[PDB]
Write a protein that binds this ligand. Structure first.
Ligand SMILES: [K+]
Ligand SMILES: [K+]
Ligand SMILES: [K+]
Ligand SMILES: [K+]
Ligand SMILES: [K+]
Ligand SMILES: [K+]
Ligand SMILES: [K+]
Ligand SMILES: [K+]
Lengths: 493, 492, 493, 492
């Protein structure tokens, strides 16, 4: 019903007064300094992502410190996300450093570890010990970004596969491999992940972007690797292959949210199907009320060019129409030449998409899916958003200590900002991956526990006033739903 | 309610047994031969587009001839579209054939025809005589694809504008200019267009893609130039700038359909805003029941590379999700290295997208916008589509001689194939720009007037059976639509 | 959604141009002559009911002949209904002709046939041989219209019940008894019913109003008693006690329609619950697409008074709002003093109720109950009525030989007349108990089988024109659905 | 969607645990004593109606006193309604105390006051001075309950009408007349009404039933007569003729509620049309959120017989189905032989009807009629009722001091009891004419101002528990409604 809303739109009308989508930026050499991080924050960054595929603990500690210093100097709360290297399948070494794979040739891939430093075009090592059990004759094995496609012909022996080379390509040492028709059964967390997750907990990161999640039991393995001290850290599962996509329901249920990793998906799945897998995964997350991030190949050509291509811009806008909470930048900010400009243009595109998005379709689709009787929390949050639309209120205020009720209200997609007043700074940071929400910290130690809620309500309404969301005479819908509840339709003074 | 439908999808399920979206291909050096046109047709081309920006009438005649021969040998009907050159604003010549424009510098643009062969970085000619009346201080004037941006400071005299150069560039001879802040008031059709359009009428083209349409009155000018022998030829308006967007409602009402020229709109409008105008223009056409084409910058990187980028793939898929009837290839087929593969890949993307699209949302959205009381045609066609969803029928058969009622059924977006049985070959060709329809030609000379309609009905049901759309025991909804009639047929 | 339609109404606006509800009249001494029957027909009678509780075969043959003669002289098709006496429970005789039952007294009720002509206040016979098996201690036994209420205390023996007399009342010979908390298991058809049903078949009656229907198997017993020659006669089941009401779904499924006998129901059930049983039974019949008649105590005081009471008039109007196809008159026309006036006032009240009834609520409630996928017939009839509302058509034409598709269209309640063109006179008569339908007979023997349907369509449209329903420029929705189908939206010429 | 709800009902299921509809009883000789008033209260009376057509102020004073004592001894709050005499048209006296009017005969009706004590079948007085201006040839003039119908032929002179007698009747002294074709322009309130209304204010009545209301302006006259000390007293307009019906919308907007006087409307309007006006007037009030009473000819035959007729029972049930807040007894309780049994039986019929009524239809019908944007009160109350249906809550508790928000919640028709907690006894009494609400008095002197609201909330939840409406683990929706607040309470 976007369709009827399209007919009423004008591209010459003003954009909204708030941007709902959130921007995650990956930190690297273009962006790690305190000053650069301040430029990012002012450009629209809400979340700093550390890519633990590269870089030492000392290197990531510097990001951690610089982010916190940059956010304190600007007076804001910025989330810190640890993105794990994850389990990997790699080839071994080749003799002469290199190996020249010709089309039509026969080669032998083995998991015999004797071969890790003496592969040749004839026979080389792949380091995934279960390779033979997981693959069958006819299956494909991809190497080097999926560029070299070997096809499996037979089991030469219990550790070695006879392969055909289907296309020509020179491959150097230790390329990554994929297995598109194959259920890969590597552990959820490598030995390096286990050390790296323990470091995130010690340093108080807000969320883990957990690589290569294939099943619900693996989300529980990440959680157990975080330990009892990491219990409040959110686990965002990165969906990267057909197994993640097949098992998406049970993964969603166990996770705190989802990353749609379109570039990794596209190694094993046709790009046009990844487009559809994106729609599916975003809508399931919207229904679960959990944050979903659209990641990889976002404004990629703006890594070295001052503008993106028109198709890239349409890609970011459509992520927002699909329902994404968050859009993520990778090399565009980590190693690019226009980090501030790419964040600002991404914010711009998101704002323009939002101005055309009919939010009421989301609200009404999600509400129609609810079973009667609803539980109290789902009834209160849905009816508070419905009151926004019925009175044309201009803001909501949600008192939420853990963020749970702020996410439940954002799930129902009011067409106005949501201000979450919370007593925890970690909730302010974790809400940066939920669309349409801004957080206000209420220091209850100094200010009092505020049992009757009046002070936290007034702080929320003041914040909305100071941002111009509301003025004297507008309506503001207030809600509390503590996991006791209460809704109010407040006439702003 | 696309959202509820996304939840139940699996990308591992089979795709639909038909592709609804239609593919238009521009013919040029890579594709004009008879054998290359057969390749395009087999790859998924429904429409051959002739770009009259280039090529003589003899050249285009060879395209027309060769298309007809290719389609005849494959036993299919292919539409031929004549895409007009249109009005252009161009600069004149520079001295030395070049002009090095520099940031901060001052220059003078004049409409004094004295300067057409003798401009310089200092002062040159722009051939649009109304330049000064239409522009104002502050306005920008883009030249060379919008690369060179000049800002207008003042009227040096009644024909000359003093401009700042806002950024550097060299510009060679005769570049095209745009006026993003400006209501350009050039003629609808130029003398060359009138000449081309009459030639289109003589050669029997099925539709005009009319460039640079800015207002409703201008559609009438194209219709005039086509003359009384061109009255059955479709006019599709190309929307290429802000005036076209602003006046969209009155243009749609006069035209037979719309082309969204993303790349031309993008000269004066930010790219994120053109994404949104595309949504709007396509939805307005879906509601009007008129074809809409998404054109330019489709799978462009596939002109020279064997695969497009992932972002280009999503752009194609999202045109189909926005509601586009057609997607159009330009240089990918006119001059590219992989014309067959690009069309096959476009068809594959369209079919993947369609298999996710909830057609019921479009049907229900459009039905709710109908004014009660409805006129009989609207009532019959919308209720015939409603009957598809109520009975889970597996095809529709629509008897339509002019294709009018076939477009009317298609507008309501049934979730099954529509087979249109028509006695006019021109109708078979013109319905190639309507999504979701396949035409079956019923030869009324060779077979009779069939005024009981039975033979024509059997021919449509026989076509749907041969495609595997229906078998024994399926329902097929049959319609003829001022007399009309709907039957829900149990298939034998 | 009657509620929103009420707000728009004016009682000073004109009534509709057609009356949808149908009137059934019972024939007796006030009405049996040919001339009186003509007055009834002109007053609004569509169905002549013969009450076979009284009167000989010769007497009912006279009604049959006079009705047919009266309808032929007026050029119309009038249905003839045979209403069966049905099984009855009666007391025997008392000594001295009479017996004086006092409150507080003990009496004995026996099924010993020795006592049929020698009852006394002390002990008398009830002729239902299963009385003892069906009743238990605490149960009530009603006698004389329910006026004398005995309560069962114990089984004196296997054929005799010791009773308390709960209220005083003199009772004469052979009163009817009821058993309100009791499942009565008398046969569906008495020996007299069996002779009487055979007579209806020989004389070609159109429908049977089958008395005291308690279960689905009893509808099949009526059907079997009609025999193979009575297979096209409709069976309308009279619901008269709690068993009929409990088993109403399976009875509806087996019957051709329902009579709500409010006076008989009210002997054993509280009047306020009968009001609700009426709503229930009419709506189940509306959903089944089968005619339902609201019968007994309709304008009863107009039997001897020239006007009815205000509550009586509100009762007839509310039967029409509840959804009744038909309203029935009993003594008001059989033995009353104002037979023409009561029919005319009943037609008047029905017309006024209809003018306020929102038909679109019926259509939309019934359509929302349909399961997808619908069968073709249900899809065609529902979509033809929907087209009436979408185009504001002013009539429908349905070609129906058996009446089945005309009833299926009437079920969906268009807000315009329905003209059924049929090749059978018995269909014209049977459609007189379906609301909103008028029939036109098409004599296919003389006029041709009309394979392409054009002649039957034009006869239907001419009929609508001659009644003023449509004129040049209006829309008329035509439908055929033969148990092949076709719908057309015709511009009237 | 009452239809879908009928399909799932069984008359053998238990009835609801509360009765929503309210019963008003007219007090007279059968019922004025303290013990008889206790009987009515225990039988189901919520409102004592005083008919000021008869009885002196001393008489009515004894009704007021006795009602208060009866209610005090039973621990309940009962509303007291003052039903005004109103304007009347009457004939004058006849000679011999009688006048034998005969079919076809001619007679003269005059407003000449000379004839008030000396009329005859030939010429008599009608005391409405505007008779001649308001009537025209053809119009009918009813006299004696509409029994004697005269037709107006001509103006004999400016004060005298020549009439045909259209049917026979004798008519004794001082009968009342009606004018069905006629816009009667008598005063809103007579001098006697002004006197009665001031006495109502001094004695603290809760509401006025204002007779013969014909226009909005006339409601203001009643409000004037009540004066500034009577500003909190409800004015319920009695709609008794065609002008009242015609002007219904403007009367509702000025009044606090409506009484549908079926028997008075039936003097000039056919009975089948009064059935329909009743539907209309009740629906308009339900939408306005104002109480509506169905009055006259309710269970009339039960004045002298121990049971009513079946048609009377259905009339009572259908008033509740039409949406009536109240049903009203007149002579059945004022002078009848079975005042307790008639009220018990009315309550039983109302409870049977309610257990079949789909309350969701009313809620949804009224919600769909709301203009967006809604004002905050409307939004809170409709969403609080929505939350009842979404969570299957088993009671509502509404804190309301003036009863305004309690009437606003009741308007939306939740399918559970509403408990209103109020600090005003007058509010407890006035809510007796609103369906579905029970009031709990919170004594703010004896217990404090409770500005945290907690004690009042507990008192309402405690009341709902004591009635068996909620138990541990049920939900209760709590509302206060310009500050407001809704909580969905899990019951402890
Ligand atoms: K990583
Ligand atoms: K928006
Ligand atoms: K062109
Ligand atoms: K689809
Ligand atoms: K009978
Ligand atoms: K009506
Ligand atoms: K009175
Ligand atoms: K109920």
């Amino acid at each position: 019903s976007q369709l009827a809303h399209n007919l009423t739109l004008s591209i010459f009308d003003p954009v909204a007064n708030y941007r709902a989508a959130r921007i995650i930026c990956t930190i690297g050499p273009s962006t790690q300094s305190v000053e650069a991080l301040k430029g990012l924050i002012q450009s629209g960054m809400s979340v700093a992502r550390m890519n633990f595929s590269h870089g030492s603990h000392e290197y990531h500690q510097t990001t951690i410190n610089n982010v916190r210093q940059a956010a304190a100097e600007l007076g804001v709360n910025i989330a810190i996300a640890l993105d794990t290297k994850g389990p990997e399948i790699r080839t071994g070494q080749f003799v002469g450093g290199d190996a020249v794979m010709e089309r039509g040739a026969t080669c032998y891939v083995t998991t015999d570890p004797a071969f890790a430093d003496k592969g040749t075009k004839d026979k080389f090592y792949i380091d995934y010990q279960n390779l033979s059990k997981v693959v069958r004759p006819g299956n494909y094995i991809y190497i080097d970004d999926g560029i070299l496609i070997l096809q499996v012909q037979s089991h030469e022996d219990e550790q070695t596969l006879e392969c055909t080379v289907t296309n020509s390509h020179t491959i150097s040492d230790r390329r990554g491999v994929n297995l598109p028709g194959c259920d890969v059964d590597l552990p959820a967390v490598s030995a390096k992940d286990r050390v790296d997750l323990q470091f995130g907990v010690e340093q108080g990161v807000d969320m883990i972007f957990a690589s290569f999640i294939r099943s619900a039991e693996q989300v529980g393995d990440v959680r157990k690797a975080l330990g009892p001290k990491g219990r409040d850290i959110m686990i965002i599962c990165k969906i990267e292959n057909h197994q993640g996509v097949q098992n998406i329901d049970s993964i969603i249920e166990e996770s705190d949210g989802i990353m749609v990793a379109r570039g990794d998906l596209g190694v094993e799945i046709p790009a046009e199907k990844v487009v559809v897998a994106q729609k599916i995964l975003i809508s399931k997350c919207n229904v679960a009320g959990k944050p979903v991030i659209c990641a990889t190949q976002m404004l990629e050509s703006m890594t070295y060019n001052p503008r993106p291509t028109r198709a890239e811009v349409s890609d970011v806008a459509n992520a927002v129409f699909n329902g994404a909470d968050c859009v993520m930048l990778s090399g565009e900010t980590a190693k690019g030449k226009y980090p501030n400009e790419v964040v600002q243009y991404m914010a711009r595109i998101c704002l323009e998409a939002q101005s055309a998005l009919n939010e009421y379709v989301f609200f009404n689709s999600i509400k129609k899916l609810q079973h009667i009787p609803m539980s109290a929390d789902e009834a209160v949050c849905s009816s508070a958003v419905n009151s926004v639309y019925e009175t044309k209120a201009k803001a909501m205020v949600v008192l939420s200590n853990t963020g749970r009720s702020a996410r439940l209200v954002a799930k129902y997609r009011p067409n106005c900002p949501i201000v979450c007043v919370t007593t925890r700074l970690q909730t302010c940071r974790q809400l940066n991956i939920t669309q349409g929400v801004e957080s206000v910290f209420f220091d209850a130690d100094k200010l009092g526990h505020d049992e009757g809620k009046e002070h936290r309500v007034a702080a929320g309404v003041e914040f909305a006033k100071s941002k111009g969301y509301v003025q004297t005479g507008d309506y503001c819908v207030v809600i509390h739903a503590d996991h006791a509840n209460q809704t109010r339709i407040l006439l702003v003074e």
